[PDB]
Amino acid sequence: NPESADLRALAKHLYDSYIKSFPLTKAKARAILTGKTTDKSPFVIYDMNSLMMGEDKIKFKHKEVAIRIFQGCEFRSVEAVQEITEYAKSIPGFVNLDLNDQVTLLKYGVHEIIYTMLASLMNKDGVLISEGQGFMTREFLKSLRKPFGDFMEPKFEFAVKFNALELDDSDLAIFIAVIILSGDRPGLLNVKPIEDIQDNLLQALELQLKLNHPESSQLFAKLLQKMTDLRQIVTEHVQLLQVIKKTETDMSLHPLLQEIYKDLY
Amino acid sequence: SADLRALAKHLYDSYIKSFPLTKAKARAILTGSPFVIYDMNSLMMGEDKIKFKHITPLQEQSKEVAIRIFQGCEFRSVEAVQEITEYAKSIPGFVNLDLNDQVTLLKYGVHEIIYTMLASLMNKDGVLISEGQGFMTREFLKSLRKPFGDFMEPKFEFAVKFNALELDDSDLAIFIAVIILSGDRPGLLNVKPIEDIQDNLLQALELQLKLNHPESSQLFAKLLQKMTDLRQIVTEHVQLLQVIKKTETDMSLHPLLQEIYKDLY
Numbered sequence: 088n089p090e091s092a093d094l095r096a097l098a099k100h101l102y103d104s105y106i107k108s109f110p111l112t113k114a115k116a117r118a119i120l121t122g123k124t125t126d127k128s129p130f131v132i133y134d135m136n137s138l139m140m141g142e143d144k145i146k147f148k149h150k151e152v153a154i155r156i157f158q159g160c161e162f163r164s165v166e167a168v169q170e171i172t173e174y175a176k177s178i179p180g181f182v183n184l185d186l187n188d189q190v191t192l193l194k195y196g197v198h199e200i201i202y203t204m205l206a207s208l209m210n211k212d213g214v215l216i217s218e219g220q221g222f223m224t225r226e227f228l229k230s231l232r233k234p235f236g237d238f239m240e241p242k243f244e245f246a247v248k249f250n251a252l253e254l255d256d257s258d259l260a261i262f263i264a265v266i267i268l269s270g271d272r273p274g275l276l277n278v279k280p281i282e283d284i285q286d287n288l289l290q291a292l293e294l295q296l297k298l299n300h301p302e303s304s305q306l307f308a309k310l311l312q313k314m315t316d317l318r319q320i321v322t323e324h325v326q327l328l329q330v331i332k333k334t335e336t337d338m339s340l341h342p343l344l345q346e347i348y349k350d351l352y
Numbered sequence: 353s354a355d356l357r358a359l360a361k362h363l364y365d366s367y368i369k370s371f372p373l374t375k376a377k378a379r380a381i382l383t384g385s386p387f388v389i390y391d392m393n394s395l396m397m398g399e400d401k402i403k404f405k406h407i408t409p410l411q412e413q414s415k416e417v418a419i420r421i422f423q424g425c426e427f428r429s430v431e432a433v434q435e436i437t438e439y440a441k442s443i444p445g446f447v448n449l450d451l452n453d454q455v456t457l458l459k460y461g462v463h464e465i466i467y468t469m470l471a472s473l474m475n476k477d478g479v480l481i482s483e484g485q486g487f488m489t490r491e492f493l494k495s496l497r498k499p500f501g502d503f504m505e506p507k508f509e510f511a512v513k514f515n516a517l518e519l520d521d522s523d524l525a526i527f528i529a530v531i532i533l534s535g536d537r538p539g540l541l542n543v544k545p546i547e548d549i550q551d552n553l554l555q556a557l558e559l560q561l562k563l564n565h566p567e568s569s570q571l572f573a574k575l576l577q578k579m580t581d582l583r584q585i586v587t588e589h590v591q592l593l594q595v596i597k598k599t600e601t602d603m604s605l606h607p608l609l610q611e612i613y614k615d616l617y
Contacts, residue, residue, distance in 0.1 A: 100441065107455055172611040179438065182431045182612075186409040190608045343607040 094291040097179065098261055101291070104177030105260035108170050111219050112256045113207035119219045120210055129215060129222040138227075145217045153235040154338050156228070157331065160239075163216075165341045167201045168193075171263075178264045180284040185276050192281070194347050195272040198321040199314070200263045206246035207259070214239070234330050241323050245316045252310055258299055261292040262310060266317070273350070325351045359444065359556040360526060366442035367525035370435050373484050374521045375472035382475060386487040391495075392417065398486060405482040406431075414603035418500035421493070422596065423603065423613075425503070428481075430616055432469070433462045436528070443529045445549040450541050457546065461532040463589070463617075464582040467507055468528060474511035479504065499595045506588050510581050517575060523564060526557040527575060531582070590617060 106112065118126040132141045138152065149162035172193060175181050181189065208215035213224040228239045254262070270282035296306045325348055331338065340348070368374065387398045395417065399408045407424035414420050437458055441447050446454065473480040478489040493504040519527070533550035535543040561571045605613065 100438070103441070103447070103451070106451055168608075169611060169614070172608065173615055176430065176434060176612065177437070179434075182434050186406060186427060186609065186612075187412060189612060190606050193608045193611070343611070346607050 091294055094287075094294045097287065097291045098257065098295045101178070101260040101264055102257045104174055105256060105263070108174035108177065109204065110170075111208065111215070113254075113259060114256055116207045116215055116219060119215060120222075126219070129220060131213075131222045131224065132216075133213075133224040133227050141221055145221045147217055149217075150337075153231040154335055156223075156231060157235050157238060158338060159216075161340065161344060164198075164201055165343055167204070168197045168343055168347075171197050171200045171267075174263065175267050178267060178284070178288075180280065181268070184280060188275050188277055188281065191272050191275055192267050192269065194350060196267040196269065197347060198324065198351070199266045199317045202242055202245060202317060202320045202324075203249070203259065203263060203266065205242055206249040209243060209246035209250070211243070211247050214243075234327065234334055238324075238327055238331075241320050245313075245320055248316065249313055252306065252313070253300075253303075254310070255299065258292075258295055258310075261288060261295050264288045265292055266314065321351065353559065355552070356556045356559045359552060360522065360560045363443065363525040363529055363556075364522045366439055367521060367528070370439035370442070371469065372435075373473065373480070375519075375524060376521055377484065378472045378480055381480060381484045382487075386480060386485060388478075389481075389486055389488045390492055395492075402482065402485055404486055407481075410603075413605055413609065414601065416602055418496040419601045419603045421488075421496060422500050422503055423605070426613060426616065429463075429466055430612060432466045433458070433616065436462050436465050436532075439528070440532050443532065443549070443553075445545060446532070449545055449549075453540050453542055453546065456537050456540055457532050457534065460537045461534065463586040464531045464579070465528045467510060467582055467585045468514070468524065468531065470507055471511035471514040472524070474508060474515070476508070476512050479508075499592065499599060503589075503592055506585050510578075510585055513581065514578055517571065517578070518565075518568075519575065520564065523557070523560055523575075526553060526560050529553045530557055531579070593617070 115126060117123075119129055122128070130137075130141050130144050132138050135152065147159065148166070149159040175189070175193060175196075181192075184192070205214065208219070211225070213222050213227075215221070216223050225239070225243050229236055231238075265285060265288045268281055268285040268288055270278045270285060275281060292310075293307045296303065296310070300306045328340075328348060329352075332340070387394075387402055389395045389398055398404060399411070403409075404424070406427035407420050410420040410423055410427075413423075440454070440458060440461075446457075449457070470479070473484075476490070478487050478492075480486070481488050490504070490508050494501055496503075530550060530553045533546055533553055535547040535550060540546065557575075558572045561568070561575070565571050
């Protein structure tokens with residue numbers, strides 16, 4: 088019971104660091120999406136006129152419309168990498184690792200985390216954008232010219248299945264830590280200390296899901312099985328990006344993403 | 353007394369759990385064995401034989417020495433922030449403060465604590481590095497090319513003054529809590545509970561210094577006066593960073609390494 092006690096202290100610390108690191112939580116996203124009075128309605132982009140109306144109404148942090156939208160999603164990923172790096176530093180043992188292994192774990196982990204957390208902002212019909220101020224429809228994203236028309240479809244397909252697990256922010260905080268502390272990332276110098284941390288995080292996630300979802304049979308196993316889909320999302324994203332880069336020689340990538348993508352293939 | 357003696361013991365126990373290299377362990381290492389870095393030749397031997405924590409992994413980013421020692425120290429500060437952050441959550445009332453205020457208190461607190469605890473690792477002749485495995489001489493640090501040659505000198509000048517107070521870990525544990533619970537940090541939302549907790553910590557520190565150092569006249573006042581010096585060190589360190597970011601180096605930190613370093617200040 089003292090062993091399980093330490094796992095609860097870890098869960099609490101991770102949930103705390105997650106709230107401090109990520110300004111748009113699943114709790115806030117669901118409040119925006121479902122019309123709760125705690126939060127404000129998003130402007131909906133579903134076509135070219137609504138996009139233009141949106142460009143004026145929303146002041147986006149992040150050229151032909153399909154290229155601008157894709158680049159907008161990539162610049163948001165740059166921001167997500169910054170937030171995920173701040174979160175990773177909070178995971179006990181992470182900053183104690185060899186600096187080069189910290190880089191390797193972030194390199195191979197950040198997109199898996201990005202698309203995990205993106206599901207929090209999605210329903211079957213679209214995705215929250217611009218810190219939840221906007222909502223871009225799935226059908227509008229599907230309507231973009233080749234090779235941009237399908238770029239978000241694998242993320243939506245994953246999200247609909249992932250969201251069926253009904254995880255909250257406290258569950259996701261531990262799950263994203265598990266994804267980062269993967270001892271099987273290519274070119275790790277010291278695997279053992281990473282595996283030891285992941286063992287502790289897996290114990291913490293199992294206990295969290297048992298306490299938080301006591302009527303959800305094998306929720307832990309079903310969540311771990313979702314890491315299969317996550318890997319395929321990232322592989323397919325990197326492959327599509329290789330095509331986009333070559334068809335659109337005028338489209339720039341941030342060096343942070345370029346350096347990550349370079350080794351992903 | 354009961355509340356104040358419980359607070360003193362609780363903070364001591366938490367400090368021992370949070371900080372691997374205590375003043376007791378550091379003074380034991382310093383008074384009798386670490387590898388001594390007194391020049392370029394000894395540094396090169398040490399890196400080859402022991403692979404120093406932050407400095408040696410940075411060989412992948414630079415062929416220069418001074419920038420790797422300085423940036424190595426910066427990455428030790430990144431790691432100290434997480435030890436201090438884990439410690440802060442054990443201070444009674446801290447985790448019940450507004451989450452934004454917790455972030456604000458650590459943002460302005462961590463650097464004063466880093467230089468407080470660095471004194472524990474210092475004598476007038478040098479500093480323990482790499483988890484106590486190395487001792488880098490004050491004269492070697494002074495020999496580094498401008499503007500790196502001066503970066504530790506203000507920390508040494510403070511450490512010699514601070515170390516003359518002859519505080520131990522049980523005293524330091526309460527003092528670092530006092531630093532964190534400062535109601536005068538900019539942008540705090542709810543100052544009342546911060547000042548309420550600091551009042552209790554100040555009472556606990558005053559009693560701890562009276563019981564632990566009964567013959568040390570006005571030790572409490574003289575320790576609180578050192579907070580002036582800590583603020584000055586942090587200010588001078590940020591000033592030096594601005595000079596360093598106009599200095600030519602071969603160091604091009606991996607973008608993910610730059611991300612890990614970002615948000616230290």
